[PDB]
C-alpha cells in the first residue's frame, strides 16, 4: 500500500486489539519452540514501538517494512539460539534473504504433546483470573502447532474460544455443556488447518496458476449467481490475500481479508442473496462465515454449454487468442452448475478439456474433430463416484480401524521405503474420511470424499518433502496437482523392497501399553502392524489379519493377567517366536 | 510419630508454604500428567481442609490417616483419567492395598519435553510480576520430571533457585549471574536424582547386605573420627530409611530421616566435626544436609591396619564366629582410612578380603596363609586409578564429543548385538563423565568416577534388561554388582559378528539436518557412526575416524549451500559412494 510507516498502516485497519494477537501468531508459527513469556515479551514490544509510528512515521525506524522489523526482533534473542546452531541464525542475511531462511524452518510437526485439559472448572477459573493471559496461550498453543493455520481465521476460533466460556461457565453441570463445544473446535479447528495447508502448499509448490483454477471452481459453486468477472475478481483477490498468509504477512493478510469482507457485502448483490446475515456481524466473525457459506441457487435458463464451448466451429479463435480467461469460463460456468461436483474433479475435467482442443486445433476438420470431447468425461466423472461408492461400503463393514488397517498395508506395501509414523498418521487420517464422507448423500459424498483425501495426501507429501525417502512418492507429489489422488491409487506394490532388518525392540512391548488411552493403544497396534508388514513384505492379510488377532489377544491377555509385567517378555517372547512360523 | 489429627499434626511441623509445596510434590508425582491449573487446586482443597483441623482436632475426617486422606482427595480426579483409561480404578481397594496399586505403575519415566528456558529478560520480569506462582511452577515441572524423587531435597533446590533469582535479577549482565547458577542446579539434582535412583536399585536388587556394605563404607568416610559401635548404629537406621523411600512410603521415611538427623546432631562429638553448623538450619535443611557434607578430618592416631587383621594368630576366631560386622568392623576400619578412595573400590577390597579368609582357613597353618593378603589389593587398588589417569589425558586431547565417538567405537565392537538407540544413550555418558571428573584434582576422582560411573553403567543394564540381545551383557548386569565394571572393562571384540545387512537408507541425509539442534544434530552423525561400524565392524579407527570427517564436512557443505535440499541427495550419494572405497 502506499505508506511511509507500513506497520502502522495496517495497525489501523485491523485494530490494537487484532494486532496483539495476529501478532503472537507471527511470533507462535515462528519460533514454536519458544515458550509463551518470550512471545507476549516480544509483541508487547512491538506494540509499544508500533505505538511511536502512531506518532510520527518518521521516528527510529517506522519507516521499514515489517519483514525488516520483523526478523529483526526475532534475533533479540540468539539465547535460546544455541538450539539452532544453524538455521535460525541467518540474521546475517538481509532482505528478502532471511526471511525466506525463516518460513522455511517452520515445522510442520513439531516434537509437542497433545494440549492436556485442567478440568472443567478449573479452566472458567483461570478464564476469570485472567481472562486474557487465558485467551492469549490458546491463540498460541495452536499456532505453533499449526505453522501454517489461516491466521485471521485462527482469530475467529479464540472468539468462539472465549464465548463458549462467557456462556458455558454458569450451570450445575457447566462441565458437559462446555467440553461438547471445545471439542466441535478442537476438531472444526484442526480441520481448517489442513486445508489451508493445502492452499499454501498449492502455491509454494505449483504457484498461483494453479491455485486461482481451484478458487474459480470452489466460488463459483458457492457464488454461482454472481457474474463471471465479478468472481474472476475475487478469485484473483483472494489470491493476494493467501499468498500473504503462506508467505508469514499475517497483518497484511488479515488487512486484505477483511478489505474483501467490506467490498462482497457492497455487491451483496450482485454475488448472491447468501451474504445478508453474515455482513451484519462483526469483521471478525465477518470474513469466516463469508466464505464458507451456502451455495446460491442456479441461473433460471441455462446455456447447458455445448454451444457455447463444443458446437462454435471457430473455437481456436477464441482459444489460441485467449487460452486463460476462456478456460476460465468453462471452469466459471460448469462448476457453478454443480454444488454437487468434487472441486479437484472440475479441474480433471478442465484439464481434460485443455487437453482436447490443444490436440484438435491441430488437424483437418476441427469443429467435427472434438464434438465427442464429453465423450472423455463420462468414465472421470464416475471413476470417483464408484471408488467413494467402494470403499464406503467397505467402511461400513471393517469399521473405522480395522479400515484404516486395510490401508495400513495396501499403502505401506506400495511404498515401505516410507517412515513408519507418517504411513500411520496418514492412514490413520485416509480412514478418518469413510467416517466424515460416508454419513452424506450420494450428490454431496463426491466432493467431501475426494475433498477431504486431497487434504490428507498433502499432510503425506509435505511429511515425505522434509524426509525424501521413496522418490515414487515424491514422483506422485510434484507430477500435477489434480492428479495426486488418481496418481497413488494406481501406484501397486513393490518387489525391490528389502524386507527390513528384524529387530527385536520393535516387537517387544511392554506393560506401558496397559496404562494407555484406547487410542494411543491403537495408534501402538497401528505402528505395530507397518513395521510388521515392512519386515517380510510380500505377505498376505490372512496371515496379517491373523498375527495381530494374536497380538491383540495377547496384550488384552497381559492386561488382564494377575500381577503381569511379567509375561509381557514371557508370552510376548512366545508371540514373536511363533508368529515367525508364517 | 504420634497424634490424633495428624492431618494437622503435621501443619505444625512445615505449617504451610512449607506444606503448600510438600502437597505439591506429593500430587505432581502422582499426577504427572494433569496440568499445573489442577494442581494449585488439588493443594488449596487439601489446605483449606487441614485449616479446619487447625480449626479443631476433630472434624470431618481430621482423624483420618495421610495415606487414606491422600488416596480419598486423589479420588478427585473423577476428571482427568484417560491417560488412567485403565489406571487408577484402585480406588475401590482399601487400606493399605490401594495405596500400592497406586504406586505400582505411577511413570518412572515421563513422556515430558525438555523445559526451554523463557529469555532471563522475561524470568525475572516473571520473577516479580507473580513471583508465587513463577515459583511453584518450577516445583511441578522438576518434581514431575522425577516422580520417585525426595521431597525434602525439591524443596532445597528450590529456595537456592528463587536464592539464584532475587540476587541475580539485577546486574549489567546478569544474564551472567544467571544460567551458570541453573544449569548448575539442573545437573546436580539431576545427578542426585539419579544417584538416589541406583541407591534403590542395588538394594532392591541385591538384598541390603550389599547396601549396609555400602553404607557402612561410605560412612566411615564422611564420619572417621566416630567409634565403630556409632557407624555400625547408623547404617542400621540409614538401611531403614532408604528401603522405605525405595519402595515408595515416601511419608514416613521423610519422617524417619528427620528422626536420623536429630541423633547426629545430637553427638556429633562422637561422630565427626563438619557437622557443628548445618545441625542449626531447620528441621527439613538437617537432613539433606547432613548426609552430604564432608570428610571429617581423620583421627589424631591411627594404628595403621594390618596387626588387626593379617594376624590376630586367629583372626577366623571373631570371624568364622561373627562373619559379618566383622568384615564390617574391617571395612569400616579400612574405608575410614581412605576418604579418596572409590565406595566400589574399597568394597572390591573387602570382598577380596572375606574369599581370602575363606580360602585360609581351609588349609592348615592360617596365619601364614593370609598374612601376605594385603597384595592382592596392590593392583586393584591401583588398576582403577591406572583407568582413570588414562581416560582423563584422553579426555584433555580429544574433548567431549570426539572422546564419545573412540567409544562409540570400542564398546560397538564389542557388543554390535546392542539398541543403537542405547549405545549412543550410553557411550555419550561416559564421555560426559570425564567432563565432571577430570576438573576435580586427583584425589576427588576415584570416587567422582566410580559413582558417576556406575550411574551410566546401571542405566544400561535397565535399558538392555528390558530387551536382552546378549547374553554377555545382562551376565555383567546380574552377575555381581561390584564386578560391573570389572566385567565390561573385560569384554573383548566380537568375531562372531554378523555385519548388519547394508540398507544406504540410513545414510540417508536430509536438510531436516541443519533445522537442528546442536546435540541432537550431532546424535545422529552418532547414531551414524554406530550404524556404520556395525555394517563391517573389523574396519579401522584411521578409516572411520576418516570417513567420520567427509560426512561432517559434507552436511556442513550442504547447509550453508546455496539453499538446497538437492544438495543431501546429488552429495549425500557421493559421499555413501566414496565411502565405499575402503
Ligand atoms: C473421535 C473424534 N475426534 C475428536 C472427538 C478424534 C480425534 O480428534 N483424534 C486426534 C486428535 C484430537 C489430535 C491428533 C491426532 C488424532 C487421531
Given at each position: 500500500?502506499?505508506?511511509?510507516?507500513?506497520?502502522?498502516?495496517?495497525?489501523?485497519?485491523?485494530?490494537?486489539?487484532?494486532?496483539?494477537?495476529?501478532?503472537?501468531?507471527?511470533?507462535?508459527?515462528?519460533?514454536?519452540?519458544?515458550?509463551?513469556?518470550?512471545?507476549?515479551?516480544?509483541?508487547?514490544?512491538?506494540?509499544?514501538?508500533?505505538?511511536?509510528?502512531?506518532?510520527?512515521?518518521?521516528?527510529?525506524?517506522?519507516?521499514?517494512?515489517?519483514?525488516?522489523?520483523?526478523?529483526?526482533?526475532?534475533?533479540?534473542?540468539?539465547?535460546?539460539?544455541?538450539?539452532?546452531?544453524?538455521?535460525?541464525?541467518?540474521?546475517?542475511?538481509?532482505?528478502?534473504?532471511?526471511?525466506?531462511?525463516?518460513?522455511?524452518?517452520?515445522?510442520?510437526?513439531?516434537?509437542?504433546?497433545?494440549?492436556?485439559?485442567?478440568?472443567?472448572?478449573?479452566?472458567?477459573?483461570?478464564?476469570?483470573?485472567?481472562?486474557?493471559?487465558?485467551?492469549?496461550?490458546?491463540?498460541?498453543?495452536?499456532?505453533?502447532?499449526?505453522?501454517?493455520?489461516?491466521?485471521?481465521?485462527?482469530?475467529?476460533?479464540?472468539?468462539?474460544?472465549?464465548?463458549?466460556?462467557?456462556?458455558?461457565?454458569?450451570?450445575?453441570?457447566?462441565?458437559?455443556?462446555?467440553?461438547?463445544?471445545?471439542?466441535?473446535?478442537?476438531?472444526?479447528?484442526?480441520?481448517?488447518?489442513?486445508?489451508?495447508?493445502?492452499?499454501?502448499?498449492?502455491?509454494?509448490?505449483?504457484?498461483?496458476?494453479?491455485?486461482?483454477?481451484?478458487?474459480?471452481?470452489?466460488?463459483?459453486?458457492?457464488?454461482?449467481?454472481?457474474?463471471?468477472?465479478?468472481?474472476?475478481?475475487?478469485?484473483?483477490?483472494?489470491?493476494?490475500?493467501?499468498?500473504?498468509?503462506?508467505?508469514?504477512?499475517?497483518?497484511?493478510?488479515?488487512?486484505?481479508?477483511?478489505?474483501?469482507?467490506?467490498?462482497?457485502?457492497?455487491?451483496?448483490?450482485?454475488?448472491?442473496?447468501?451474504?445478508?446475515?453474515?455482513?451484519?456481524?462483526?469483521?471478525?466473525?465477518?470474513?469466516?462465515?463469508?466464505?464458507?457459506?451456502?451455495?446460491?441457487?442456479?441461473?433460471?435458463?441455462?446455456?447447458?454449454?455445448?454451444?457455447?464451448?463444443?458446437?462454435?466451429?471457430?473455437?481456436?479463435?477464441?482459444?489460441?487468442?485467449?487460452?486463460?480467461?476462456?478456460?476460465?469460463?468453462?471452469?466459471?460456468?460448469?462448476?457453478?452448475?454443480?454444488?454437487?461436483?468434487?472441486?479437484?474433479?472440475?479441474?480433471?475435467?478442465?484439464?481434460?478439456?485443455?487437453?482436447?482442443?490443444?490436440?484438435?486445433?491441430?488437424?483437418?476438420?476441427?469443429?467435427?474433430?472434438?464434438?465427442?470431447?464429453?465423450?472423455?468425461?463420462?468414465?472421470?466423472?464416475?471413476?470417483?463416484?464408484?471408488?467413494?461408492?467402494?470403499?464406503?461400503?467397505?467402511?461400513?463393514?471393517?469399521?473405522?480401524?480395522?479400515?484404516?488397517?486395510?490401508?495400513?498395508?495396501?499403502?505401506?506395501?506400495?511404498?515401505?521405503?516410507?517412515?513408519?509414523?507418517?504411513?500411520?498418521?496418514?492412514?490413520?487420517?485416509?480412514?478418518?474420511?469413510?467416517?466424515?464422507?460416508?454419513?452424506?448423500?450420494?450428490?454431496?459424498?463426491?466432493?467431501?470424499?475426494?475433498?477431504?483425501?486431497?487434504?490428507?495426501?498433502?499432510?503425506?507429501?509435505?511429511?515425505?518433502?522434509k524426509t525424501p525417502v521413496s522418490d515414487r512418492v515424491t514422483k506422485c507429489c510434484t507430477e500435477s496437482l489434480v492428479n495426486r489422488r488418481p496418481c497413488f491409487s494406481a501406484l501397486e506394490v513393490d518387489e525391490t523392497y528389502v524386507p527390513?532388518?528384524?529387530?527385536?525392540?520393535?516387537?517387544?512391548?511392554?506393560?506401558?501399553?496397559?496404562?494407555?488411552?484406547?487410542?494411543?493403544?491403537?495408534?501402538?497396534?497401528?505402528?505395530?502392524?507397518?513395521?510388521?508388514?515392512?519386515?517380510?513384505?510380500?505377505?498376505?492379510?490372512?496371515?496379517?489379519?491373523?498375527?495381530?488377532?494374536?497380538?491383540?489377544?495377547?496384550?488384552?491377555?497381559?492386561?488382564?493377567?494377575?500381577?503381569?509385567?511379567?509375561?509381557?517378555?514371557?508370552?510376548?517372547?512366545?508371540?514373536?517366536?511363533?508368529?515367525?512360523?508364517?
Open positions: 500500500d502506499a505508506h511511509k510507516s507500513e506497520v502502522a498502516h495496517r495497525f489501523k485497519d485491523l485494530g490494537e486489539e487484532n494486532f496483539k494477537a495476529l501478532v503472537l501468531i507471527a511470533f507462535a508459527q515462528y519460533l514454536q519452540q519458544c515458550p509463551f513469556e518470550d512471545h507476549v515479551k516480544l509483541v508487547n514490544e512491538v506494540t509499544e514501538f508500533a505505538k511511536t509510528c502512531v506518532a510520527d512515521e518518521s521516528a527510529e525506524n517506522c519507516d521499514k517494512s515489517l519483514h525488516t522489523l520483523f526478523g529483526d526482533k526475532l534475533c533479540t534473542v540468539a539465547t535460546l539460539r544455541e538450539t539452532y546452531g544453524e538455521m535460525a541464525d541467518c540474521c546475517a542475511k538481509q532482505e528478502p534473504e532471511r526471511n525466506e531462511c525463516f518460513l522455511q524452518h517452520k515445522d510442520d510437526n513439531p516434537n509437542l504433546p497433545r494440549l492436556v485439559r485442567p478440568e472443567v472448572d478449573v479452566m472458567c477459573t483461570a478464564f476469570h483470573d485472567n481472562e486474557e493471559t487465558f485467551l492469549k496461550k490458546y491463540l498460541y498453543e495452536i499456532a505453533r502447532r499449526h505453522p501454517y493455520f489461516y491466521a485471521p481465521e485462527l482469530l475467529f476460533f479464540a472468539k468462539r474460544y472465549k464465548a463458549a466460556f462467557t456462556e458455558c461457565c454458569q450451570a450445575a453441570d457447566k462441565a458437559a455443556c462446555l467440553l461438547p463445544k471445545l471439542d466441535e473446535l478442537r476438531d472444526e479447528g484442526k480441520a481448517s488447518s489442513a486445508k489451508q495447508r493445502l492452499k499454501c502448499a498449492s502455491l509454494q509448490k505449483f504457484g498461483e496458476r494453479a491455485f486461482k483454477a481451484w478458487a474459480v471452481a470452489r466460488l463459483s459453486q458457492r457464488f454461482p449467481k454472481a457474474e463471471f468477472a465479478e468472481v474472476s475478481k475475487l478469485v484473483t483477490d483472494l489470491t493476494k490475500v493467501h499468498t500473504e498468509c503462506c508467505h508469514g504477512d499475517l497483518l497484511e493478510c488479515a488487512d486484505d481479508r477483511a478489505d474483501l469482507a467490506k467490498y462482497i457485502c457492497e455487491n451483496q448483490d450482485s454475488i448472491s442473496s447468501k451474504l445478508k446475515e453474515c455482513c451484519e456481524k462483526p469483521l471478525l466473525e465477518k470474513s469466516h462465515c463469508i466464505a464458507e457459506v451456502e451455495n446460491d441457487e442456479m441461473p433460471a435458463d441455462l446455456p447447458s454449454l455445448a454451444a457455447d464451448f463444443v458446437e462454435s466451429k471457430d473455437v481456436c479463435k477464441n482459444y489460441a487468442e485467449a487460452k486463460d480467461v476462456f478456460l476460465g469460463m468453462f471452469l466459471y460456468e460448469y462448476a457453478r452448475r454443480h454444488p454437487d461436483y468434487s472441486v479437484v474433479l472440475l479441474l480433471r475435467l478442465a484439464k481434460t478439456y485443455e487437453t482436447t482442443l490443444e490436440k484438435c486445433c491441430a488437424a483437418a476438420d476441427p469443429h467435427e474433430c472434438y464434438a465427442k470431447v464429453f465423450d472423455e468425461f463420462k468414465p472421470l466423472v464416475e471413476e470417483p463416484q464408484n471408488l467413494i461408492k467402494q470403499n464406503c461400503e467397505l467402511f461400513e463393514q471393517l469399521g473405522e480401524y480395522k479400515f484404516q488397517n486395510a490401508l495400513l498395508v495396501r499403502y505401506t506395501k506400495k511404498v515401505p521405503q516410507v517412515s513408519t509414523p507418517t504411513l500411520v498418521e496418514v492412514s490413520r487420517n485416509l480412514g478418518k474420511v469413510g467416517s466424515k464422507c460416508c454419513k452424506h448423500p450420494e450428490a454431496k459424498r463426491m466432493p467431501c470424499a475426494e475433498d477431504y483425501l486431497s487434504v490428507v495426501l498433502n499432510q503425506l507429501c509435505v511429511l515425505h518433502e527390513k532388518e528384524f529387530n527385536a525392540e520393535t516387537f517387544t512391548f511392554h506393560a506401558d501399553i496397559c496404562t494407555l488411552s484406547e487410542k494411543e493403544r491403537q495408534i501402538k497396534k497401528q505402528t505395530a502392524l507397518v513395521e510388521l508388514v515392512k519386515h517380510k513384505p510380500k505377505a498376505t492379510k490372512e496371515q496379517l489379519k491373523a498375527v495381530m488377532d494374536d497380538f491383540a489377544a495377547f496384550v488384552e491377555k497381559c492386561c488382564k493377567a494377575d500381577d503381569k509385567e511379567t509375561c509381557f517378555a514371557e508370552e510376548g517372547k512366545k508371540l514373536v517366536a511363533a508368529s515367525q512360523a508364517a
